Design a protein around this ligand. Structure first.
Ligand SMILES: [Zn+2]
Length: 850
């Protein structure tokens, strides 16, 4: 495929201005077997040239270009190649080009994807075009700053539904096909054009008119999955977003209708094609899941909806602004979740999941500025981008930020814009100087630590208060400007819980900033210098506040300050400032009202329990790890047993046990729940919980390959196959690890997700000794894997098999010795990242036994 460079795109954009595409797709052969390889694609493009007589090109990736006709002249396409496209010599002022080609389906979710379903034989298609794979379906100037209208017409097998960006009309052809004529779209970038086609099950709803017109809504999924799709709940959350964004952005939904389609083998998660959003099928839940998965699905639904304005109505000029596109949609989705849905605690989720991913990534040796240069198409973090964007909102002011956004949307509608265009609208709205701001926040790496320096009188009121900021590390050590809030918490007189008794908001700059507003204010029991989680930083506490956190974290009433305390404790553990055994004690608590057992936010419970298992396996001193896991598994069994029957908390406690190093008593209890002899009342032991408990029994030698085979026969599905592959990898024998290693490293015929699933069961915290010999085999065999497989398939093998299990200096020495060699750069990067994790675990283990 072509590697369109930025300069090439700029040259073409200076020259051309595209009015309209008329696309005709002949998919009548699309319902056959695996051999069907191509479909008919006719494109008519009307565009203008600013220099008559000039030359330019148009992109297309097809097997055969049958006909190309520019302004009525037949072009020579005998020498056509996918990488070169079609040359357009001797351009006129106004041009019309007609191309007839044969484009091919894909098995990679690049371009037009084709997939066939076993349950019923159904054949399902969908487009994935971001970044520049629109050219695999139609002839186009495939770059985001040459917007055009599209009129799409598809002839399809008569039982297929067809969905596109715009609404359409269907006509029976009398030849076993139907013809789908879609309205001309509003102007949009090529990467946002959509086609979804197959025997999809359909549900319909409508969002009523609110200056915003009525919006027709649809939801589509594979026929085989329709029984599991909770369409009513998806439509409620969809309607909640459309009532929110118009008011927040001041601009009504820009397109006519809104379809959301769940599609098979989706690599991308979700994709904001205008009026036709595509979703990964993991968002259709076949088993009982906790409320956190529903929340995360709602966030992604609103993420893609926000892109209808930011991304689709106004689009980046070039892909170096991809970060901003995603970052904004992340912020806007959480804004909408809190403002419009049942997920009112969604900033707690952002602080605990998104921010903690941002920090971890920022502190890697691979760290880079949020706004990287993108010179080409293969040159194409977001967590940090989202985090930094939230701080940009705080610094500008929310009210000013939204006011600037309406200005931006109005000014650039149906057109393109850059980061600088946004920053200018936000400067005009706020009075701030954002030139300085980007240089400090978007072109730098690393984190500042923020902590209070305080003094109190006899009555407990502040006599002085400042915020201390450390240099940005890893990076250039600059001090940033932060708009933050300082929160003071103290006992509630009616309940005894810790509640907020003061907040002040202020600009923090430099190494130290005094807060005169706090002089005379009672210091309470807990001071948070990043209260409301406004800025991106490493927050630290004064001595008394840290003691209160350790003693009474479960007592904090509001979920966001409580989550910020869980985050602080965790990031202190990662950084070797809090002992891994002290994090574990804090999490496990001593009573029904302390520690994570008293945490009401189910997303926090799951995340904190995961981090605790990281602290035990990776950060606890090896001499103490057996006792730590004895404490963890016993506390979790007691929490699962005490939990309310059928509740999310009960399920989360059982799921955490399934990932743990377990003693006999836990194994016996778990066997009883799986086979029914001694069930946990209320616990729904459905298909995916069965796999979870079976995998745990397998990992501890309590179930053999017979039982894996038995569970696979009761769950003969693609998902079941993957969970069965993980279980076979988990078998704690040298023979099973050798087979799994060989299959993951050397079998390229196996499908991608099956290779993924094999690797996912290679590691287990109770099997460290079994895997010792694979530290050396990793570094001996990684170059061969990188050479043999493509980078997309090699990367998950390299990341997933890195021996993060072996926390030892010998592992660092083998990684060091490998780094001394000549290896591909991208591969050195991944080994560097894995090496850094082990270094960090060694420092934590050193601190823990101290
Ligand atoms: Zn996005």
């Amino acid at each position: 495929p072509p590697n369109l460079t930025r300069e090439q795109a700029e040259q073409r954009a200076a020259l051309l201005e595209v009015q309209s595409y008329a696309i005709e797709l002949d998919l009548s052969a699309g319902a056959g077997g695996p051999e069907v390889e191509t479909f008919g694609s006719t494109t008519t493009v009307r565009f203008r040239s600013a220099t008559p007589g000039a030359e330019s090109w148009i992109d297309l990736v097809a097997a055969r270009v049958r006909s190309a006709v520019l302004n009525g002249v037949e072009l020579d396409v005998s020498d056509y190649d996918e990488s070169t496209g079609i040359r357009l010599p001797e351009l006129a002022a106004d041009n019309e080009l007609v191309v007839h080609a044969d484009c091919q389906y894909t098995n990679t979710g690049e371009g037009l994807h084709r997939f066939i379903d076993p349950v019923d034989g159904g054949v399902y298609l969908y487009s994935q075009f971001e970044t520049a794979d629109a050219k695999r379906m139609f002839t186009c100037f495939d770059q985001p700053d040459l917007k055009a209208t599209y009129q799409i017409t598809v002839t399809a097998p008569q039982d297929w539904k067809v969905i596109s960006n715009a609404a359409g009309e269907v006509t029976d052809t009398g030849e076993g096909t139907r013809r789908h004529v879609f309205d001309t779209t509003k102007p949009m970038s090529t990467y946002l054009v959509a086609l979804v086609a197959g025997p999809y099950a359909e549900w319909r709803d409508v969002f009523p008119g609110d200056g915003q017109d009525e919006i027709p809504l649809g939801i589509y999924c594979r026929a085989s999955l329709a029984e599991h799709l909770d369409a009513e709940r998806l439509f409620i959350e969809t309607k909640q977003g459309f009532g929110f964004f118009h008011k927040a952005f001041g601009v009504p939904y820009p397109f006519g209708k809104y379809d959301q389609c769940f599609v098979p083998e989706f690599n991308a998660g979700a994709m904001e094609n205008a009026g036709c959003v595509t979703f990964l099928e993991d968002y259709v839940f076949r088993s009982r899941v906790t409320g956190y998965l529903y929340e995360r699905r709602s966030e992604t639904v609103l993420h893609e909806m926000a892109h209808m304005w930011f991304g689709d109505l106004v689009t980046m000029r070039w892909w170096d602004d991809l970060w901003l596109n995603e970052s904004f949609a992340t912020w806007a989705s959480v804004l909408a979740q809190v403002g419009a849905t049942q997920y009112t605690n969604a900033w707690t989720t952002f602080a605990s999941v998104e921010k903690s991913w941002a920090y971890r990534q920022d502190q890697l040796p691979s760290t880079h500025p949020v706004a990287a240069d993108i010179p080409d198409l293969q040159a194409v973090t977001y967590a940090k981008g989202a985090s930094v964007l939230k701080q940009l909102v705080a610094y500008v002011g929310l009210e000013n930020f939204l006011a600037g956004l309406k200005v931006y949307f109005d000014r650039h509608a149906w057109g393109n814009a850059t980061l600088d265009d946004l920053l200018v609208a936000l400067e005009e709205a706020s009075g701030r100087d954002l030139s300085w701001w980007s240089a400090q926040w978007l072109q730098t790496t690393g984190l500042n630590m923020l902590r209070p320096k305080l003094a109190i009188d006899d009555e407990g009121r502040f006599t002085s208060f400042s915020v201390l900021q450390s240099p940005a590390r890893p990076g250039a050590g600059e001090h940033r400007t932060h708009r933050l809030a300082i929160g003071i918490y103290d006992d509630d007189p009616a309940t005894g819980e810790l509640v907020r008794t003061h907040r002040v908001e202020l600009d923090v700059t430099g190494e130290r900033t005094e807060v005169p507003d706090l002089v005379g204010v009672h210091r309470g029991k807990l001071v948070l210098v990043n209260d409301d989680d406004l800025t991106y930083c490493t927050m630290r506490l004064d001595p008394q506040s840290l003691a209160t956190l350790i003693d009474r974290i479960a007592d904090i009433q509001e979920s966001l300050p409580r989550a910020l305390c869980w985050s602080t404790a965790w990031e202190m553990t990662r950084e070797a400032e809090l002992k891994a055994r002290d994090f574990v004690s804090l999490v496990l608590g001593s009573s029904p009202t302390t520690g994570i057992g008293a945490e009401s936010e189910i997303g926090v419970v799951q995340r904190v329990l995961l981090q605790t298992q990281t602290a035990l396996a990776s950060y606890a001193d090896p001499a103490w790890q057996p006792e730590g896991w004895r404490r963890f598994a016993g506390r979790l069994l007691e929490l699962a047993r005490a939990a309310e029957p059928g509740s999310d908390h009960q399920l989360a406690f059982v799921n955490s046990l399934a990932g743990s190093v377990l003693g006999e008593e836990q194994i016996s209890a778990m066997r009883g729940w799986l086979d029914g002899t001694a069930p946990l009342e209320g616990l729904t032991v459905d298909t995916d919980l069965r796999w979870g408990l079976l995998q745990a029994l397998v990992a501890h030698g309590a179930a053999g390959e017979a039982e894996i085979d038995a569970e696979l026969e009761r769950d003969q599905t693609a998902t079941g196959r993957r969970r069965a592959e993980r279980a076979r990898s988990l078998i704690p024998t040298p023979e099973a690890k050798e087979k799994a290693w060989q299959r993951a490293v050397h079998d390229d015929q196996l499908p991608n997700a099956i290779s993924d699933a094999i690797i996912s069961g290679f590691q287990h915290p109770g099997q460290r000794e079994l895997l010792a010999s694979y530290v050396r085999r990793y570094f001996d065999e990684i170059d061969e894997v990188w050479h043999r497989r493509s980078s997309e398939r090699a990367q998950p093998t390299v990341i997933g098999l890195f021996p993060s299990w072996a926390v030892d200096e010998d592992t660092v020495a083998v990684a060091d010795r490998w780094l001394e060699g000549e290896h591909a750069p991208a591969l050195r990067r991944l080994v560097s990242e894995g090496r850094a994790g082990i270094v960090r675990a060694l420092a934590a283990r050193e601190f823990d036994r101290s």
